[PDB]
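Minimal example, chain plus LI8.
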Amino acid sequence: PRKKRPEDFKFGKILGEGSFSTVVLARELATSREYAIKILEKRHIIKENKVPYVTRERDVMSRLDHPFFVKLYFTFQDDEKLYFGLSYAKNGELLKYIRKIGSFDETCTRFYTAEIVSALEYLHGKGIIHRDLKPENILLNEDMHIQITDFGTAKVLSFVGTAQYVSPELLTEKSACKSSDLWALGCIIYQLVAGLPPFRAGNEYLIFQKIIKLEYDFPEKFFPKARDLVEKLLVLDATKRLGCEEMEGYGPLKAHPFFESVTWENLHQQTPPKLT
Ligand SMILES: CC(C)(C(N)=O)C(=O)NCCCNc1nc(Nc2cccc(NC(=O)N3CCCC3)c2)ncc1Br
Ligand SMILES: [Cl-]
């Protein structure tokens, strides 16, 4: 089809700024479609030795075809920049709703947790480890269904993701795996229900000390079935986390009492519960 150029677009406001990128809202002049265009500067990529990560990311986004992930429509580059045309997730980051509404009720916690597990099942199925899952990476579309992004740092089957969602193995033998993603899910489930991440401290080194020592507590408010699930994900021994291959995969995880009423088969077709 048509190989796109910057002039083919009417760029608008900035949707997000990373250390190596800026996602900008663009409207395609010929169709009026809105896209979230990720813009990367070749110079900064090179001098910062990031080529391996930019290639990785595009190559993962090529292999993914599922509704809970931001899609890559096209790419193009100019003299000093690379451009990736991605799905524009209208409602933005999930972190905003957590902060906006405070915390989630059980219905919302279960529906959104189910969408995350279904998306992890898919990703793990292609042999890709996100390695940096967090509420800032999980977006909500026009219909409030999740749309996961930020794959520059994924591992296809070195680094350390956001301090509070990093698992123990990384802080030790520095090696992450599929269970690293499950650790982050436990952290995120806790965060949805409590309104706050489980391992938190004044500084990063302190956050790390807690993680390795598994120093965190559950508020009395915490729904008990969600709590039982969180204790099955927040495990130091990665071969013991509900969801990993040694624990027989997603079947047992999906079969958790917390998910009793979920219909796993058509979630994105389902009307998400109203965030209150
Ligand atoms: C990877 C990274 C760091 C980036 N900037 O490249 C990134 O932030 N990705 C997610 C957001 C941008 N990408 C994207 N953002 C949206 N949608 C969207 C729509 C409205 C608001 C926001 N942004 C926020 O809510 N933010 C909270 C405060 C600042 C952003 C994001 N859709 C697709 C992408 Br790809
Ligand atoms: Cl992004």
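The radius of gyration is 19 Å. Residues 15-18, 21-23, 36, 38, 70, 86-90, 92-93, 96, 139, 149-150 surround LI8 (ligand 1) (CB under 6 Å).
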